[PDB]
Design a protein around this ligand. Structure first.
Ligand SMILES: *[C@@H]1O[C@H](CO)[C@@H](O[C@@H]2O[C@H](CO)[C@@H](O[C@@H]3O[C@H](CO)[C@@H](O)[C@H](O)[C@@H]3O)[C@H](O)[C@H]2NC(C)=O)[C@H](O)[C@H]1NC(C)=O
Ligand SMILES: *[C@@H]1O[C@H](CO)[C@@H](O)[C@H](O)[C@H]1NC(C)=O
Ligand SMILES: *[C@@H]1O[C@H](CO)[C@@H](O)[C@H](O)[C@H]1NC(C)=O
Ligand SMILES: *[C@@H]1O[C@H](CO)[C@@H](O)[C@H](O)[C@H]1NC(C)=O
Ligand SMILES: *[C@@H]1O[C@H](CO)[C@@H](O)[C@H](O)[C@H]1NC(C)=O
Ligand SMILES: [Ca+2]
Ligand SMILES: [Ca+2]
Lengths: 376, 375, 69, 138, 69
């Protein structure tokens, strides 16, 4: 039991139930959070009708800001990545930036296109409140304004959730007054690739937004593909995942290198600085990317299996780069230093007021007044 | 310190030694060890090394899938939000013996995947602790809050690894990382036993003692040292001869500076409880709890229907495993001095299982077929 | 008028619902306990007038004129 | 508000509001109709920012006990002490010679003044609902 | 007797074939297409190296086109 609302395309919205529309704003609207005992809040920052940055808020003390280009902050600081903290593990996944909260219950991504996704849980049933709408199975009455009344205009509904903070005051939002050649949107209605998602969801609304976008078409093939990922992800979460689409006309969702976009990748994503513990990856299929099969992933990019560097004291060394100790030395194999033991000299220091050091290493203080035997 | 007439003996924990020609002659017997979490940022290897390492994801306490032999067990001690010792800290332990997990979290045990060898699988609730027996040698002792201990008998000698060392009798080399290299400071040692490769390894705290939550007051730094100097005050002066309170004091200075406690005093009583527990293993039982210093009661679960039959008391260390209609024969519980609240019913009418009321021996299982309770 | 709904529990903190504007409300509504007003601290206690400022700024839409109101 | 000890963390001022927001949780909801929990909340927020507790926790339980004292004067006795929230015991003084005869128990408010060989007559004790550990002999 | 699995990923020079370029090992010589009776149980041939085109495209005489055409 876990739903999904997403912000995608350019100026589009989907809720926890399906009723989906458009909106372009300026004022960091409220995307989720119970409105009787708040206890956390997801806030979605926009800019000039676009989607810039994403942020949570725990209580009234802790902030985190995530941004679309992968830079993360603290409210006034600039933290690195991954950065685990008081709950709330920022990480990376099949190539996307995941923010996981399991004590409270939610998980939020941001992919290369800057598309947001948040998955809630079953204990927030009939208690969510924000812009993603309430969470009950009945899918029609999901426009309750902050007053509690119900409306019909998307803009009048969604302007009641904007949040302003001090320096940033915000205005009322007005629909853009700008109106408008191939129809590839029906690719959801002809081919048998999508034919198995038909008895779970109705492909009409997606065609509707697809022609809405077709109106714009500031480009060659950008018209339809952002309208096509979302339907795949929706009917994937609905219970049956589509297999091997994108092989006909899709526009290759982007991730940096390797580009091996595929469905059903294990989030564990075996690399070579690992303990190869099996049996403990019980996570569902997640779309994303990776890099072929014969390569293992490093922190930046992924390298062939023959070149996993070793680590000492957090440094990285290329294979066959023997370090030298005082007593011994040994050589980096495939991430497995192999030294040979050998006895090396010992020293017994006696310094300070009364501070000794044994032959092995034990440090201590004695301070007695007589003659004593130090070695023999 | 003391005199010893010739021919007299002395026993040290596990072995006995006698005087022969001004020199002690006595026998060797490698016997069991214990790796434990002293408090909530410090560890104690099998050979008695103390180190500091605060992390926040899943790590490896002790396993044996590292040598040139097929592994058997594996215990993982992933903790939640304990990169800082605040009161919000919670810990979880998962045990993978043959084909199951146990999930020590919050209340009690789970059995999420039955083991095919329940022939030596027990769970015991005595005092304020829970005792798990997982094989001929392996045991786990749990406080129910934050202290986890593990006992291995002499069979597993030189055959394990993890954040608890390799159990061979040498301290110096028992700090090796997962890739066969001996580190220098504990922080870069412990990153190597991390299970998931997406944890943001802890960096390093550069400062000295009295963490930053202290030393800016020294009105709070000089109350903490005296508040838990009771480790040397009047009850522990007999312990101090046998085990030195140098490391446990330095645990107490930590995680009391760094632990903003408001109405929950558990962040402080548990360190003193650890030191007292270690004394009890040396035959030096102590009593230290007053009416104004970490008080404890166990009269709440006292049959509210009538209650006049006061069947519960708080004892010093309450010998550990008592038979009932659960395991009607003595076990091998490696503690024998569990502090807690204890039931002292007369020789007849032993204690029951579920309703916590001593009853006459009729209410034992009818038969032991299929290993079921059978009332 | 008997058709008006009787309100239930009054709520004290409005910016538990708009956490974006928590820093601004505390920072701005702090002139009242500052040497600018020090002469008047002995004439009327600025205790109610401070929590009023915090509530006004956290709650109302246009906090620019709620501050100086 | 929030003396100089607080408002410099707000990882502690957000931990002391919810630590003693229990005055409105589930048991005191009867009191909230008859006595409002507003001044006692301000009492609790204070002297817990400015009271660093290390091994002693009376600096916090006393405020809750004072509010409970106020409630019981209005005939709304409550029970709030658990094993993990300000625990209390009184069986230490239980005749250690034998101990099996338990004559002391912890009651809700243990009505105040009882007769014995001290004053064999009723007194004027204007509380009559004194919480504590009590003896209930036949 | 032991076919090599998943090489060519390090330093190979991509052995050339006209279309698809999906050089891979252990490909069935049955080479399923849509102009066939989808008869199974009669692909009992050992592994052979060669080429094909992804998975979602079926081979025609000249090249391979999506299943819809
Ligand atoms: C990802 O996007 C964010 C925002 O879209 C980028 O952050 C922005 O970075 C610029 C460059 O430093 C910041 O401008 C600077 O602002 C300071 C303070 O006003 C000023 O003193 C400097 O002279 C400069 O103008 C800008 O404030 C900042 N915006 C934020 C943090 O909201 C970020 O750089 C992007 N990531 C990458 C890798 O470029
Ligand atoms: C949601 O909760 C309200 C109030 O608790 C109730 O009236 C309503 O029927 C609930 N809706 C559903 C679908 O259960
Ligand atoms: C100790 O005593 C035993 C028998 O009493 C003897 O065999 C052994 O050699 C003695 N060892 C030493 C070191 O004296
Ligand atoms: C604890 O139990 C043991 C065994 O029943 C008993 O000898 C001892 O007196 C008890 N301690 C107390 C304080 O009652
Ligand atoms: C408290 O005392 C009164 C009067 O003796 C009694 O009726 C009541 O049951 C007692 N409360 C408890 C919890 O024992
Ligand atoms: Ca709904
Ligand atoms: Ca060793």
């Amino acid at each position: 039991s876990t739903a999904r609302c997403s912000l995608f395309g350019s100026d589009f919205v989907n809720t926890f139930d399906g009723s989906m529309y458009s909106f372009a704003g300026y004022c960091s609207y409220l995307l989720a959070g119970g409105c009787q005992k708040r206890s956390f809040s997801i806030i979605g920052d926009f800019q000039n009708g676009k989607r810039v940055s994403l942020s949570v808020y725990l209580g009234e003390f802790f902030d985190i800001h995530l941004f679309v280009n992968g830079t993360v902050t603290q409210g006034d600081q600039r933290v690195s990545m991954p950065y685990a903290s008081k709950g709330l593990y920022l990480e990376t996944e099949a190539g996307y930036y995941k923010l996981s909260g399991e004590a409270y219950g939610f998980v939020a991504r941001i992919d290369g296109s800057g598309n947001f996704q948040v998955l809630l849980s079953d204990r927030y049933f009939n208690k969510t409140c924000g812009l993603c709408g309430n969470f009950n199975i009945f899918a029609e009455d999901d426009f309750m304004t902050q007053e509690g009344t119900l409306t019909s205009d998307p803009y009048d509904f969604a302007n009641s959730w904007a949040l302003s903070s001090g320096e940033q005051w915000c205005e009322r939002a007005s629909p853009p007054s700008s109106s408008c050649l191939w129809e590839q949107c029906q690719l959801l209605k002809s081919t048998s690739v999508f034919a198995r998602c038909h008895p779970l969801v109705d492909p009409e609304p997606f065609v509707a937004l697809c022609e809405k976008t077709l109106c714009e078409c500031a480009g060659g093939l950008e018209c339809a593909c952002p309208a096509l990922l979302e339907y795949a992800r929706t009917c994937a979460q609905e219970g049956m995942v589509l297999y091997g689409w994108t092989d006909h006309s899709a526009c290759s969702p982007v991730c940096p290198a390797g580009m091996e976009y595929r469905q059903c990748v294990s989030p564990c994503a075996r690399t070579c600085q690992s303990l190869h513990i099996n049996e403990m990856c019980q996570e569902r299929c997640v779309d994303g990317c990776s890099c072929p099969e014969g390569q293992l992933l490093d922190e930046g990019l992924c390298v062939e299996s023959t070149e996993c560097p070793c680590v000492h004291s957090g440094k990285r060394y290329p294979p066959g780069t023997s370090l030298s100790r005082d007593c011994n030395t040994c050589i980096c194999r495939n991430s497995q230093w192999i030294c040979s033991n050998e006895e090396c000299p010992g020293e017994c220091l006696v310094t300070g007021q009364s501070h000794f050091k044994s032959f092995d290493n034990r440090y201590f203080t004695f301070s007695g007044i007589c003659q004593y035997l130090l070695a023999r | 310190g003391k005199e010893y007439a010739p021919g007299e003996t002395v026993k040290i924990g596990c072995n006995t030694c006698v005087c022969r020609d001004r020199k002690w002659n006595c026998t060797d017997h490698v016997c069991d060890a214990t790796c434990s979490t002293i408090g909530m940022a410090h560890y104690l290897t099998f050979d008695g090394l103390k180190y500091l390492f605060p992390g926040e994801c899943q790590y490896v306490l002790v396993q044996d899938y590292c040598g040139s032999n097929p592994g058997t067990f594996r215990i993982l001690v992933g903790n939640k939000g304990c990169s800082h010792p605040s009161v919000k800290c919670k810990k979880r332990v998962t045990i993978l013996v043959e084909g199951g997990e146990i999930e020590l979290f919050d209340g009690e045990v789970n059995v999420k995947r039955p083991m095919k060898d329940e022939t030596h699988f027990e769970v015991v609730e005595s005092g304020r602790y829970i005792i798990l027996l997982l094989g001929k040698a392996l045991s786990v002792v749990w406080d129910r809050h934050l202290s986890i201990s593990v006992v291995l008998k002499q069979t597993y000698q030189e055959k394990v690894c993890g954040l608890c060392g390799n159990f061979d009798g040498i301290q110096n080399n028992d700090l090796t990382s997962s890739n066969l290299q001996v580190e220098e400071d504990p922080v870069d040692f412990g990153n190597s036993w991390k299970v998931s490769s997406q944890c943001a390894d802890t960096r390093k705290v550069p400062l000295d003692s009295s963490p930053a939550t202290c030393h800016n007051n020294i009105m709070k730094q000089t109350m903490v040292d005296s508040s838990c100097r009771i480790l040397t005050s009047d009850v522990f002066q007999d312990c101090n001869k046998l085990v030195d309170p140098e490391p446990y004091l330095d645990v107490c200075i930590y995680d009391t500076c760094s632990c903003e406690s408001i109405g929950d005093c558990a962040c402080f009583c548990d360190t003193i409880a650890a030191y007292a527990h270690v004394c009890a293993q040396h035959g030096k039982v102590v009593t230290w709890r007053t009416a104004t210093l970490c008080p404890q009661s166990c009269e709440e679960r006292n049959l509210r229907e009538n209650g006049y039959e006061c069947e519960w008391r708080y004892n010093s260390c309450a010998p550990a495993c008592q038979v009932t209609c659960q395991h009607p024969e003595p076990l091998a519980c490696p503690v024998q001095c569990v502090e807690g609240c204890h039931a002292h019913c007369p020789p007849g009418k032993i204690l029951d299982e579920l309703l916590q009321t001593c009853v006459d021996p009729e209410d034992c299982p009818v038969c032991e077929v299929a290993g079921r309770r059978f009332a | 008028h008997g058709d008006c709904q009787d309100l239930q529990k009054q709520h004290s903190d409005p910016c538990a619902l708009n956490p974006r504007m928590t820093r601004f409300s505390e920072e701005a509504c702090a002139v009242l306990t500052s040497p600018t007003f020090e002469a008047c601290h002995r004439a009327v206690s600025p205790l109610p007038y401070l929590r009023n400022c915090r509530y006004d700024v956290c709650s109302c839409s246009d906090g620019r004129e709620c501050l100086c109101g």
